[PDB]
Write a protein that binds this DNA or RNA. Sequence first.
RNA 1: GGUGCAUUAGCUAGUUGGUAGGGUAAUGGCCUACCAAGGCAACGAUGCAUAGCCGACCUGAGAGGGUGAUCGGCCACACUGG
RNA 2: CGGUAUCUAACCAGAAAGCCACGGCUAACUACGUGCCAGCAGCCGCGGUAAUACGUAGGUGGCAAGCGUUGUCCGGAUUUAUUGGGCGUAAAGCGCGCGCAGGCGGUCUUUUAAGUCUGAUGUGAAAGCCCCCGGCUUAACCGGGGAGGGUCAUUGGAAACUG
Lengths: 131, 88, 199, 80, 135, 156
Amino acid sequence: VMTDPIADFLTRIRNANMVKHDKLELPASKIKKEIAEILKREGFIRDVEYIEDDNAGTIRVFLKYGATGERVITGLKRISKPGLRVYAKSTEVPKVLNGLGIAIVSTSQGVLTDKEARAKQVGGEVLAYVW
Amino acid sequence: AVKIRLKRMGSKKKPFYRIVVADSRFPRDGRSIETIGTYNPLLDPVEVKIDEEATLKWMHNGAKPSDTVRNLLSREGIMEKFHNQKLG
Amino acid sequence: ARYTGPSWKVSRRLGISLSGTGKELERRPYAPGQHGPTQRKKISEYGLQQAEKQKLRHMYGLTERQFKNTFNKAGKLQGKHGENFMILLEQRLDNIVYRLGLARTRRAARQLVNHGHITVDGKRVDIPSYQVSVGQVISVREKSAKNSAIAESLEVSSFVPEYVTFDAETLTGSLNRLPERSELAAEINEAFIVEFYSR
Amino acid sequence: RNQRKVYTGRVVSDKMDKTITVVVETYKKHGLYGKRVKYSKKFKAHDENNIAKTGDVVRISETRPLSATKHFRLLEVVEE
Amino acid sequence: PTINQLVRKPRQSKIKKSTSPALNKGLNSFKRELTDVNSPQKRGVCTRVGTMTPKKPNSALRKYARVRLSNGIEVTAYIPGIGHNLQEHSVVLIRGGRVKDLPGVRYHIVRGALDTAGVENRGQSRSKYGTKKPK
Amino acid sequence: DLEERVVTINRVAKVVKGGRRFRFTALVVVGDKNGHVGFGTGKAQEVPDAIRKAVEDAKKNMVFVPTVDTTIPHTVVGHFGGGEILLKPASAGSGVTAGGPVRAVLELAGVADVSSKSLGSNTPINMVRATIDGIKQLKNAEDVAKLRGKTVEELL
RNA sequence: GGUGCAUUAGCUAGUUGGUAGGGUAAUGGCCUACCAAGGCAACGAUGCAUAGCCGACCUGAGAGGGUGAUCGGCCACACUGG
RNA sequence: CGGUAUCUAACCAGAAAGCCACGGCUAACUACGUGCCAGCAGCCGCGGUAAUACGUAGGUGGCAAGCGUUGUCCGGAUUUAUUGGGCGUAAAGCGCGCGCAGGCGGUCUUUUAAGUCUGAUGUGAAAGCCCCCGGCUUAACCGGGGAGGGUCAUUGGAAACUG
Ligand SMILES: [Mg+2]
Ligand SMILES: [Mg+2]
Ligand SMILES: [Mg+2]
Ligand SMILES: [Mg+2]
Ligand SMILES: [Mg+2]
Ligand SMILES: [Mg+2]
Ligand SMILES: [Mg+2]
Ligand SMILES: [Mg+2]
Ligand SMILES: [Mg+2]
Ligand SMILES: [Mg+2]
C-alpha cells in the first residue's frame, strides 16, 4: 500500500489463490469496498464480511473454489497504474476473454462492470481485468 | 466577378462537366466556391441536374452565367423563373 | 488459347483429371519427363499448397496475373473466402459455354468466344473474361448456327449442370441461380489455396 | 456578438510598467506513451492601475494587440 | 524503463548502413561537393587490371580490376565470365554485389554494356554476361 | 483411430573411447480430427525404427481442446521453456495460420480457423510443448458458467 | 501540431514596458524624442546542420515506419543584391 | 482530332515466345567435357579425373510480351519491445552517501469541475482508400450517393477516480 492500494489488493488475492488458501483479510476503504462486492456478484468470491476496527476497519474475504479442486479466479491484471493512468471511451471499452472475463470501470455513476457500462453508454478509468 | 461555368472531368474524348460557381480569376478546374450540378453531353437528350434553389440566391448576389450554362438553364425552364423574381 | 502446349503433360503431372475424366491419365500415368517413371518423392507442405494452387488456374487455363485479381475481388465478397473465389471463377462465360455443351472442351470454348460467335442479351461479346450474372441470356448470334463443330459438340452432352438451363432448339442458355460449391467440380480442397496467398 | 478567449493563471512578475506576466499551467496527454505532462506557457496582460500583485490568481482575456507582445487585458483579481 | 524514464529520453533506433557506398554519391563540378543521391550504376575508367588469389580455402586465380568512378573515387571491381578483353584505360559500367572469397573487392562489373564485350559461347544463363541470341 | 504425423528427425551422436556413435531422434504428433491430439518422442539406431517407437509414446498423452463454432473460444498464450506462442481465434473460413510445427498439432486436432505467432525460441521440441500448454487454458462457455454459478445468456 | 545535434548554455540593447508624436487600410517599437531596466531559456532559449507545408502515396494485423513525383490547396522565387 | 472509333464483306493456320532456375532455404535430374584449373556464390559453401552446385546437351519447374540483375523503402526484426524486451554467470545495478528541481504519494467528509465521460450545434474542400448503385462489348478507367477521418471549437449535462 506504499503507492497503489488497488494493485496491492489484486496481488493479495492472486498470491492466496496460488497456494489454495481459503480466507484473507486486509484494511478497508471506500473504493476497496465495492470492488470486493462486484466479485461476489459473479461468484468469484464465496462471500465477504466487513469488520469494524479502531483505525479504519478491515474486510474479510472468503475465496471460493469449485469442487474437484479447480480454482475460480485464474488471474488478475491492472491497467490504470499510478505511473500511467488509462481512460477508455464508451465505444472502446474492451471485452475480456470474449466476454468470459470481467472488467471494472469507475464511470461517472459509481464503480461499474463493463457489462452494463457499454449498455449505459459511459466510459471512465479502467481499473482491472479479471479472468 | 463570380461567373457560373463548367469544369472538365472524365477520360479523353469522354467529357463530363460540372455546373460550378467560381471567381473569374481562378483556373478552369482549380478552386471553386460551390458545386451546383452536372451536365453530360454524351447522351443525346442531355443529362442535366441543377439545384434550382441555390442558384437562385446566387443570381440575386450577382453571378453572371456562362454562354452555354445560360442555354442549359433556359432549356431547363429555370431562366424564366429568374425573370419573375426580379420584378419583386 | 493462352497456353498453346501439349495438352496431357499438365493434366497428369498435376495428379488430377484436368478437363473431364480419364482421357489423359488412361495409360502411362507416370509423371512427365525422363524421370517420373522411376519414383515419387514425398512432397513438402509447400508443394502441397502450391500444386493445388496450380490445380485451379490450370483447370480453367487462365494466366496467373488475373488469378490474383479474381481472388482479390472475391475477398470483398461476403461468405467464406476460399469458397466464393471458386464460385466467382465459375461464372466466366467459357464455362457457361462449356457447361452448356456448346464446346467439347474449355480451351475450345475460349477459341469459340474470342472469335465473337456468341452474344449475351443480344450483343456481341468478344472476351472470355466476362462474367455473366443471373438472368442473362446466351445465344450464338444466329450467324454460325449451322457450323458443323458446334452441333457436333452438342451431341455428347454428358450431363448438363442443374444450375443452368439450355435447349438446342434455339441455342439459348442462362444461369438459373448461383452455384453451391458442391455443384462445382469441388474435387480439390479450397483451404490450401487461401493459405498460399496469405503467406 | 462574438467573445474572445478568456483564461486564468498566476502572476509571475510586475517589473514591467503597467503589465503583468501570468502562467497558465495545464495538462496534456503526451505524444506516444499517453502520460499527462504539466505544460505551462506564460502570456502578458494589461493593468491600467497596477492593482495586481505577484502570486495572485486572475482571469485574462485576448484582445487587440497593444504592444510588441501585449495582447491580453485583465478582468478581475480572483484572489491574492 | 519506467514510462517517465522513457519520456525524459525516448527510444532511438539504430542506423543501418549501406553496403555499396560508392553507388550513392555525386560530384557537383561547380562547387566541388559530394552530393548524396542514389544510383544503381555508375560509369568509370580502368586504372589497372590483373588477377588476385582467393582467400582460404578456395585456391583459384580471379580476374579483378581497379576503376576510377565518375565521382572521382577509385575502387576495385570483379570481372565475371570466362575471360575478358579489358585493356587499361577503358570505360566500364559498374554495379553492386560483393564476392565472399576476395577480401577487398565489393563491386562487380556488368558484362556487355560498354568496352566489356559479351562472354564467348554462353548457351544458357545469357541475360547475364550479355551475349546475343545465337540465331 | 489416430493419424500420426512426423515433425522433425535429428541425428545425434555421443563420443566414445574409440570414435563416434550416431543415433536418430524423431518427434511425431498424433491425433484424430475430433479434438484429441498428442505428441511423442523417440530414439533408436535406425530411422524407420525410430518413428515406430515414437508413436507408442504419444498415445499416452492425449489431450482435448474446446472447439466452439469450429474455432478456439478465446485467445491464450503458451509459455513453456524458451518458446512462447499465442493463439487467437480467426474468422470463419480463414484457415489455420501457424508456423511449422505448430500447425501440425492444430491440423490433427481438428480446428479449422485460428491465428498464431511463435514469439519465443524456434526449437521444434519446445514449440509443441508450448502449444500443448497453450490449449490447457482454453475453456468452453458452459464450464465457466458451472464454476461461477451463472449460465450462458448473461455471459454472452 | 509536426526534424537532429548539449562532443551546441546562456541570449537580447528598439531589446522589454511606459509618456507623447510621426507613418499606413488598419492595431502595433512599425518609427521618432524622453523615462525605467527589463524580456526570454533545461517545458531546450542561442548557435549549427537538414528541409517548402498539407490533402495524400508505399508498407504494416495494429500501433507505427519511409516519401511529399504526377492531381488539388497554401507559400516563396524569377541571372545575384538593393 | 478525322474517313479516327465502329460495322459489313472476302482470303490463309498461314505472318506472331522468350527469360530465369533445377544441392538445402525452394517448385523442378540425367549424360558428357574439365579436374583446387577454367570458374559459381543471396547464406550454408561447391570444385585436388565417377560434380543432382563449373561449361554444354536432353528433360523438368516458374512466369509470360515479358523475364532476370543492380539500387531505394516497409515487413519477417519482440533487432529501441506504449500495444511488445531486459540487467547473478550470456552486453547490461553508477563505489557509496547528503540531497535542488522533477516523478509518485495512507484513511474519511464537504465543496470546485483543470483532467475525465456524455448530449446538441458548426466545421474537418474537391479528388484518393472503403461501401452502395450506373456507365464504357469486360477490366483498367469513368460517373452519382454515403461513411470515416480531430487529444477541433461554442454550449448544456454527470461527480466515481486524478488534480
Ligand atoms: Mg499481361
Ligand atoms: Mg461576442
Ligand atoms: Mg531546399
Ligand atoms: Mg510488425
Ligand atoms: Mg549446372
Ligand atoms: Mg520493430
Ligand atoms: Mg565474464
Ligand atoms: Mg557480464
Ligand atoms: Mg552496488
Ligand atoms: Mg473529401
